[PDB]
Structure formats: C-alpha cells, structure tokens
Write a protein that binds this ligand. Sequence first.
Ligand SMILES: Nc1ncnc2c1ncn2[C@@H]1O[C@H](COP(=O)(O)OP(=O)(O)NP(=O)(O)O)[C@@H](O)[C@H]1O
Ligand SMILES: Nc1ncnc2c1ncn2[C@@H]1O[C@H](COP(=O)(O)OP(=O)(O)NP(=O)(O)O)[C@@H](O)[C@H]1O
Ligand SMILES: CC(C)CCC[C@@H](C)[C@H]1CC[C@H]2[C@@H]3CC=C4C[C@@H](O)CC[C@]4(C)[C@H]3CC[C@]12C
Ligand SMILES: CC(C)CCC[C@@H](C)[C@H]1CC[C@H]2[C@@H]3CC=C4C[C@@H](O)CC[C@]4(C)[C@H]3CC[C@]12C
Ligand SMILES: CC(C)CCC[C@@H](C)[C@H]1CC[C@H]2[C@@H]3CC=C4C[C@@H](O)CC[C@]4(C)[C@H]3CC[C@]12C
Ligand SMILES: CC(C)CCC[C@@H](C)[C@H]1CC[C@H]2[C@@H]3CC=C4C[C@@H](O)CC[C@]4(C)[C@H]3CC[C@]12C
Ligand SMILES: [Mg+2]
Ligand SMILES: [Mg+2]
Lengths: 563, 563
Amino acid sequence: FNWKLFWQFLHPHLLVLGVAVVLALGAALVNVQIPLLLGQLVEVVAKYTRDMTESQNLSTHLLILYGVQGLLTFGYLVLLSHVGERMAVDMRRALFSSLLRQDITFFDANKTGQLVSRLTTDVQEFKSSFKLVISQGLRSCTQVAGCLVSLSMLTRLTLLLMVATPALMGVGTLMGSGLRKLSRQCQEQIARAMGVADEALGNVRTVRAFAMEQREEERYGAELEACRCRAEELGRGIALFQGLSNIAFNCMVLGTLFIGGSLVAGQLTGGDLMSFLVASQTVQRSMANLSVLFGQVVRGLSAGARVFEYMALNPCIPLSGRGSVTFQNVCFSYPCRPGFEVLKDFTLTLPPGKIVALVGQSGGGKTTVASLLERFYDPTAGVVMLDGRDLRTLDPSWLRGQVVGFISQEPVLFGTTIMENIRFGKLEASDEEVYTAAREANAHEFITSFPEGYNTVGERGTTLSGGQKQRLAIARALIKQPTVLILDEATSALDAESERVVQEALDRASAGRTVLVIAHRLSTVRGAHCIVVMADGRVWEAGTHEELLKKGGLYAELIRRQA
Amino acid sequence: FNWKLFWQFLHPHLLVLGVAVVLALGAALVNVQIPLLLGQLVEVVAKYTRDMTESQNLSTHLLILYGVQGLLTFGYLVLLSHVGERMAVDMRRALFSSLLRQDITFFDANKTGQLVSRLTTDVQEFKSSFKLVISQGLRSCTQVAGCLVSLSMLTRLTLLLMVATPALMGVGTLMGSGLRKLSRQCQEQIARAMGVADEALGNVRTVRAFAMEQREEERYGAELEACRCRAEELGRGIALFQGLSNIAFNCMVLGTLFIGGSLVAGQLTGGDLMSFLVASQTVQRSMANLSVLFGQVVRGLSAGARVFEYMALNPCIPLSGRGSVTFQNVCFSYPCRPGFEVLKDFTLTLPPGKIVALVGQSGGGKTTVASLLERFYDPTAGVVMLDGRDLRTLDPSWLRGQVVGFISQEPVLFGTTIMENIRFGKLEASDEEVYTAAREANAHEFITSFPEGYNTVGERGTTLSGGQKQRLAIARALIKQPTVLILDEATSALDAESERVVQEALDRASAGRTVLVIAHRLSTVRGAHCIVVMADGRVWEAGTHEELLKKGGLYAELIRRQA
Ligand SMILES: Nc1ncnc2c1ncn2[C@@H]1O[C@H](COP(=O)(O)OP(=O)(O)NP(=O)(O)O)[C@@H](O)[C@H]1O
Ligand SMILES: Nc1ncnc2c1ncn2[C@@H]1O[C@H](COP(=O)(O)OP(=O)(O)NP(=O)(O)O)[C@@H](O)[C@H]1O
Ligand SMILES: CC(C)CCC[C@@H](C)[C@H]1CC[C@H]2[C@@H]3CC=C4C[C@@H](O)CC[C@]4(C)[C@H]3CC[C@]12C
Ligand SMILES: CC(C)CCC[C@@H](C)[C@H]1CC[C@H]2[C@@H]3CC=C4C[C@@H](O)CC[C@]4(C)[C@H]3CC[C@]12C
Ligand SMILES: CC(C)CCC[C@@H](C)[C@H]1CC[C@H]2[C@@H]3CC=C4C[C@@H](O)CC[C@]4(C)[C@H]3CC[C@]12C
Ligand SMILES: CC(C)CCC[C@@H](C)[C@H]1CC[C@H]2[C@@H]3CC=C4C[C@@H](O)CC[C@]4(C)[C@H]3CC[C@]12C
Ligand SMILES: [Mg+2]
Ligand SMILES: [Mg+2]
C-alpha cells in the first residue's frame, strides 16, 4: 500500500537507480575533493606572495577534476529526471485507470476539482520532491562523510570543530525561529483583538439604519489601544530575545575560534589551517540542505501516502459483471444524509412500446426516480423487472450499452471531432452509419454550413448553438438503437422553432421503442399516451389524460396554475 | 495621497525616526568594525601557532565593541517597533473612521471579507515590511559603504574584488533562476497537456451512461505520452543549462581567485589577506539582503498605495447634512446592472396613523421598494413627501434617528451587553427607561431566567433563541418612539406560540404611529387596514380587504394558491 505498492511499481527501474547512485557517489566524492585543493592553492599563493612555479600544476589538476565533476553531475541528474518522469507518467496512468472504475457515490461524495488537482499537481509535486530528495540527501550525506573523514585523516581538532558546527548552525537559525515566533504571535494577537470592525461591517444595513457611528468609534479605539499595549510588550519581548540570541551567538563564535585553536596548538602543517577554513562553508551548506530536505521529505511522504490511499480501492458494484420494464415496491434514499428520504413505496410499469411521461412541480425527486434503472444506485428495497429477468443478474455493461439510451437537459461535448464523437457508443462504427444517423437526427443539414465539418473539434474549438448541441446528443443516443429511451427536459431554455424541430425529431426517432420523458411544461405532454402525476415521494396519480381531466385531482390544480 | 498623506501622517515622529537612524548608523559601523578585528585575531593566532601574548587585548577590544553593538541594536529595533506600531494603530483608526462614512453603493459593490482583510492584515503586513526595510536597507547600505571604504584604505585590489563580487552573486543566483524556470516550464507543460481527464471527470454521469471507458484510456495514454516526450526534452534542456551554469560559475571562481592575487602581488601586509578574506561573507550577505528587500519594498509599496487609495474617499451623499408620508411617480433601479429595472412609476401614500401592508410572491422588488425612504439610495425620479417637507432638504441623520424605526427578518447582536445594547438609539439612555422599554417589548420576563441578566454579552457569549432575538429588536426600536415604523417579515421561521406572542407585542407597540409591514403569509395580513397587491414593478392593486375579495384580481389567485 503505502510502501509495498510503491516498491512493486518501482521495481523495474532498479538497475538505472543503482547507476544513478554510483554517479551521485562519484559527484559527491569530487565535490569533496575540490575545496581542499582550492585551500591548498590559495595558501601556496599567499605564501609565495609573502616571500607561481607550483601553482600551474595544481590549477590544471583542479580543472581536470572539475570537468569530471560537471560530466558526473550532468549524467546523474539526467538519469534522475528520466526515472522520475517515467514513474510520474506510470503513476498518473495507473491512478486514472483505477479511479475510473468507481461508482457514483465516490464522485458525488467528493468534488471533481480536488480529485483533478490530486491526480495531476499533487503527484507532479510528489515526483519532484522525491527525485530532489534522492539527489540532495545522498549528495549531502556523502559530502559530510567524505569531508569529515578527510579532515580527520589530515586530527581530533577537526572532529571537535565538526561537533561544534551544528550548535553554531542552530544558533544562526535561532534568528529565523525568532522571526517565525514574532510573526505567529503578532498574527494571534491581531486575530484575538480584532473582530469588532468585522462584526460592524458584516451587518452594515442595521448599523446605518439605527443612526449611530460614535459608539463604534470609541469601542474600536479602545480595542486598538488594548492591541496597541499588547503590541508594545510583544515587541519589547521579541527585541530582548533577539538581542540575547545575537549576543550569545557571536560570543560563542569568538570563544570557539579562540579556544579550539589554542588547544590544538598543543605540530601541524602551516598550510593546514588555510585548507581547513574552506570546508566549513561546504558543511554549513550541507546541513542547511538537510534542514530544508527534512520538510521536503515530510511533505512528499504525506502526498505519496494520500495518493496511494486514494489510488487503489474496491468498486462498490461490479462494472464488468427486449421487452417491458417495471418496478415493484422500490424505495430508496440518497446515501448521504439518509434522513432526507425520497421513495415511499413506488410502483410503476412501462408498457412495451408506448409513450410514458412524468410531471411535478418538484415531485419529491422526480429526476432520481427517473434514474436507478441504469444501476447508478442499488435499490434499498423492492424489485425491478426487465424482459422477465432481474437487472441484478443481467450484466450492467450490456444493459448500459445495448438497452438504455439517455438524454440529459445539458449535452456534453469533448475535444474529439464530431465524426468520432457520434461514434461514441461503439468504436466499430463504419462510415455510412454515422452519416445516416446524423441525417435521421437532423444534424447533417446544418453541419454542411460548417467549413471543416466532420473534422471540427469543443470548448477550445468552434462553438455550437444550443439546438445544435441537442441535435448532436440525439445522433449518439440513436447509434445503438436502444430499446428503452430516457429524455430529461428536452424542451430546455431555447426558442420555439428549434424546440418544435427537436420535438419532431424525437417523435420520428421514438417509434417502436419504449421511451420515458420528463417535462416541466404541461404543453409538451398532452400528446403522450399516459401521464403520471407525482407528489410527496409516493405516486399520486397515473392514467390517461382525458380521464385525468375528469378526475380533477392534483393535475387539475397544476394545469390551472400553469395556465 | 500615495505620498503626501503618508508624509503628513508620519510628520509627528520625525525626531524619533532620526534618533533611530543615528542608532542604525552606529550599529552598522560597529558591525563593519567587527570582521576586520576577527580576521586580525585569527591571523595572529595562526602566526603564533606557526612559530597568545597579544591576543588577550584584541579579544577584550572585540568584546567591548560587541557589547556596544548589542546595546545599539536593542535600542534601534525597540524604537523601530514603537514607531511602526504607533503608525499602524493610527492608520487603522483613521481608515476605519473614513471608511465608515461611505454609502451602501460601496458596501454592496464590494465584499465585506476583502474589506476587513485589507483593513487589518494588509496594513499589518505593510507596517511590518516598512519597518523591516527601514532597518535592513539602511544597515546593509551603510555596511557596504563602510567595509568598502575600510578595505580601500587598508588598495585597488579590494575595489576589483568588490566589483567582481556582484557577478559571482549573480552566477550563484543563476541556480535559483534555473530552478524557477524549471518549475514554471513544468507547470505550463502540465497545464497545456492535461485537461482530458478534467473534461472526462467533469461530466461523469454522461461518460458512465453511454458505456465506454476504453476510448478515454487510449486518449489519456496518448496525451500522457506526448507530455512524457515534452518532459524528456524539457528535463534534458534544464540539465544542460544547469551544468553550464555550474561549470562557468566555478571556473570564474578559480580564475578570479588566481588572477586577482597574482596581479595584486605586483608589497602589502602578510596578515592583510587573512583580514580581507572575512569581509566577503558579510558583503555577500548584504547583497542577498538587498535582493530580498527589493521584493519586500515592491510588495509594501503596492500594499500601501492600495490602502491609501481606499482610505480617503468622498461620500456619495452627505451624512451630517410628525405626519404622513407619501410617494409620487418614484422610479428607481439598482446602480449595478441598470438593465434590471425595478420601479415602473410607483405611487403610494401612508395615512398618518393607520396600518399599511404590502404583499407579493416576488413583487418585483418589494423589499427594495419598502426601502428608499431612509435615504439608502436616492430616487431616480419622482418625489417623496414627509410631513409637508421634502426629505432631501431634511437632515438624513434626524430622519434616521428620530423618525423611522426598522425591523429586519434577521436581528443583529453585538458583543456588548443587553443593557447597553438596548441603549443603542441614544447613548443618553437613563436607567428606568431601559427596563420600561424591555417590559413593554416583552423582554424583562425571560431575561430574569438568565443568570447574569443585563450583564450578559453575542457570538462569543450566551446564545439566545430566535424569539428572544426578535424580542430584543422590538425594545431597541421602541427606545426612540419612532413616528414611522417598518417591519420586514416579523413572522419569520419559528413556532406558532412565539409568533403569536411577538405579533401581540407588535400590536400593543404599533399604536398611534404609522407602520408599514411586509408579510409573505396572507394569514397575518387580514387584520390590517389596507392591502397593496404588487406585481411586475408597477403597482397592481391597493384597497381594503373586504373590497379586495369582491374585486377578484390577482389577490384572488394569490389567496387561492396560498389556501
Ligand atoms: N447527487 C446528490 N447528492 C445529494 N443529494 C442530492 C443529490 N441529487 C439530488 N439530491 C437531493 O435530493 C432532492 C431530490 O432529488 P432530485 O431528483 O434531484 O429533485 P428534482 O425535483 O427532481 N430536480 P428538478 O428537476 O430540478 O426539479 C433534491 O432536491 C436534492 O436536494
Ligand atoms: N444589494 C443588491 N445588489 C444588487 N442587486 C440586488 C440587490 N438587492 C436586490 N437585488 C436584486 O434586485 C431584485 C429585487 O430586489 P428585492 O427587493 O431584494 O426582491 P424581493 O422579491 O423583494 N426579495 P424577497 O422578500 O426575498 O422575495 C432581487 O431579486 C435581486 O435580484
Ligand atoms: C544565509 C544564512 C541562512 C547562513 C547561516 C548563517 C546566518 C544564520 C548567520 C551568520 C551571520 C549572522 C548575521 C550577523 C550580523 C547580524 C546584524 C543584525 O543587525 C541582525 C542579525 C545579523 C544580520 C545576523 C543574522 C544571522 C546570521 C546571518
Ligand atoms: C586546527 C583546528 C582547531 C582549526 C579549527 C578552526 C575552527 C574552530 C574555527 C575557524 C573559523 C570558524 C568558522 C567561521 C564561520 C562560522 C559560520 C557559522 O555559520 C557556523 C560556524 C563557522 C563555520 C565557524 C566554525 C568554527 C571555525 C571553523
Ligand atoms: C545560501 C546561498 C544563497 C549562498 C550563495 C552561494 C550559492 C548560491 C552558491 C555558492 C556554492 C554553490 C554550490 C556548490 C556545490 C554544487 C553541487 C551541485 O551538485 C549542485 C549545486 C551546488 C550545491 C552549488 C549550488 C549554488 C552554490 C550554493
Ligand atoms: C589582495 C587581493 C587581490 C585579495 C583578493 C581575494 C579575492 C579575489 C578572492 C579571495 C577568496 C574569494 C571569495 C571566495 C568565496 C566566494 C563565495 C561566492 O558566493 C561569492 C564570491 C566569493 C566571496 C569569492 C570572491 C573573491 C575572493 C574574495
Ligand atoms: Mg430532478
Ligand atoms: Mg425583498
């Protein structure tokens, strides 16, 4: 999981990782070798000035070692970039493939934006931090080990200086610690003291209505005077703290610089000190690198842990697991907030080859009741029958792809061209079938005016009209010739002529197949066969329009309100 | 404005600012003096080791100078904290006082949260950055000047080294420049390549409904392969760039360290080089401080400019500039989005001492029409008459504080105790008047059960019930005994018993004064005198209830729908 899956998916790059490790070791070794050589060169130059024959050979040796260093670092970090990039691409592909299998509960429980952000940016940052750690931590640890070993072989004074160096680094970072403490304390004091202005401006209508602005002024002044006092003591305390930090820090610097040399004096090389004074900068930089890299590691491990936790799950319902359809005592509620119940013992049947509609001002979840047949959510109770067989035993993929077609009140378009976008239900689509379907759904006529035509991309491409988008949805819906059709508010917000055209297209398309339509305007339903009036969860009424007028139930009130 | 106002408001601290400047000069001078002394001490220690009588005096001198440095820095930054804190408090108070004068157009055009953030956090950060710049920039510039002068007086080689130092600093920062370029290029490539997954997950219902997940898989794989290739070339380019940066940087380091010494060799002090090698770290730190401080200055100046731009404005309508009230042909629309018009030639009058109501399912802006008499917004056309005098010539403060009382459907509570919160219309409130008003508005009865009582604070204090909150508002409104009263949905979302109690309280409170009430439920209006039915901007109907029933207009449809 957090480690086993990562190790399994990182296994096929072990050889390249080892080669990179070797290159890093070489680069760190040469980087360790450089500063001592530079110190010796500057020391011999200074001694020659005090009194360049021997400097040329040392300079050439430094140049050769440094060219080797450049080649080694180039090879290392190009290999590291290759490995990290390959790992990132593989992880992105695997995460997308595994996440695409989940049901709707995961999707509507969370948000799409955060999922996309985690899928792309979080894993990119994880890979970046991971390879940066691989480089820097190994390089710096090997640098520290090599320089310490060389200085010890060069005695105990070097070990004492190395031990003292971490204390000096901490004393130096104490300034930044004081800075963050100052910032945090100031922010906390500001948050605690303020709020009166926020409360006053939050409800400005009332404060303007009742006519005073003076009481707020002295209250705000008193609050700011209190925050003012607290600020004086906080600043004074921070001042004393930083002053003590500085005094102690440089007192320790001077004391060490004196005592260590005085004690080590009790016979080393004259130029040994000059060569020793340069490695301090390198070791200090290394410890700073470790200090920052600790935060890099913690952030990266947290990101990787959450990525791998959300990467591999178990689908709630398996995805790969010609007649009438009916319900029986089906009740259901949304998984989130089960207190809001939806279905009170809902029973309904669809005649095999007749038009069925449904209507209600709010219904009590008419759209979700129109759902639940595509196995979007399993029913809490009751049974659903289709062609004499239960939908549970039937494979959901077969029912999705060869039985039920779905039209929403908003169509969806992708960057793929229209010719392939229509070929979306089956990828085995031939040539002439696409044009025939487009002609049947009234899409070939207007697509001619487009300059590119069937090669036009979408959001980043040419924009199509709402009626054109509705026409585009219909051809894809009819490619499979579904036995059951579902329409959700086909008569959306658009003009009258295009609405009539698309209604006629649906009429000549919805022939010989059972189709269920959901409409809000009652003027588009009188041409249907049967009408079901919904109110308060349970079914309110169902029957023919001509008898529904004589019934005088809730439908009479609804049509009176609409008229 | 951006500078003149700042100078005027900073004027009364010039003496303290100058004293701080002097202290900073002293601290910078001693900080300049320290490194040369440390270099001389370490050089003489090394020379003694090569062959501590003279080291003690130099160490004592360093300790004395360094104690002086500590005292100077303490005094400087405590004075700086005092000055900055005083400036911040004064600016906050002035900004609040000036902003509180603005009309409602500013408030509803912008957001309260951003205003509060700018008022508190932006000015706090501005003050912090401003004093940090005052300290660091002066200290570092004086440090650079002093060290350069001392090294020159110590020759042209020092000037050459100082000139070369900025180039080395830039070469060092080239690594961070490459880092930011790498990050930006990677982010841009990720943003350009991605989007297919975002589009697929944005509409998951449709992609799940039409049954395919394969086509998305090869499209996503192709997109990731393209991004993969682009990543290989981008990483290779960054690799070569950083390799060239490093090779050139340390080649320049070695070349300078050789050539400068070789040329300067052509008779300085033997220990001069050791004392010179230490000031390089100080000057490098100073240039780093300037580099960061440039960003601090730009951010601070932007923040201060926006603060001062929004700090002093000109109110749209002046704030300090017994009978019936009536309208005449008053039309108005909201200043933002004038296309959405509201008032179509609205005429209405209020009898002096009778109950008037208004109702509508949406009205066309019934609430904003109920407004516009408190001078919240000036009328576009028409006239408003009150007691035979125009409201424009009358002082808005007098009308706000001694004429009109306002009750909203949501009450507002502050952290101030109830005893003073009731005393909100006038601060001259005596003792017994508050208790009498509380008893009249039915608030003294339930406040007894509270343990603290009239000393109870609110959001951070004890929580009161909705009916209790409504009762607080009636007493506050009753303090001034307004001649005109306005109620907006008194029968809010709450139980029946408390609704009846508060309605009775309003009835025994609304006696002898003209009051206008807005209600949504028609069951609370039949007891009024006259009813005005609103529909589609213009006035639809007005008259008595008993004749409105016989009229059979839109009121009949509304009451039929409600029933
Ligand atoms: N994905 C969801 N997650 C949680 N709650 C939901 C979800 N979808 C719907 N609901 C809630 O369940 C209620 C009923 O479901 P729904 O079928 O969407 O109502 P509806 O009246 O048919 N929609 P409409 O056609 O716009 O009037 C809704 O009012 C929502 O509050
Ligand atoms: N402060 C505002 N800024 C911009 N637009 C506003 C503002 N207030 C209201 N509007 C718009 O103007 C319309 C009419 O004004 P308003 O009086 O608030 O409607 P209303 O029907 O009386 N409100 P309600 O009592 O909840 O039904 C509203 O529907 C808003 O869309
Ligand atoms: C770049 C950093 C992280 C390297 C680590 C060494 C740092 C922490 C140490 C070494 C020398 C120190 C500086 C020496 C001079 C004083 C002057 C005083 O007015 C403010 C603090 C200041 C400026 C010190 C801040 C901390 C300091 C910069
Ligand atoms: C022969 C032996 C004793 C030589 C030992 C010399 C040691 C004790 C002295 C000589 C110069 C000193 C360094 C001068 C610069 C500072 C920068 C600070 O950020 C960390 C400590 C550090 C890096 C000091 C560490 C100790 C130091 C290295
Ligand atoms: C703390 C900083 C800002 C001080 C300024 C000097 C910096 C920019 C210079 C001085 C010495 C340089 C380092 C010398 C060693 C190499 C090893 C290589 O594998 C990565 C870059 C790296 C690590 C260089 C990075 C930049 C560098 C750190
Ligand atoms: C007598 C005269 C010529 C002495 C001149 C010595 C000069 C040329 C040499 C001696 C040691 C060198 C310094 C060694 C450390 C680096 C750190 C880097 O981040 C900036 C440049 C810098 C700071 C070098 C600047 C030039 C330098 C100061
Ligand atoms: Mg719905
Ligand atoms: Mg309103």
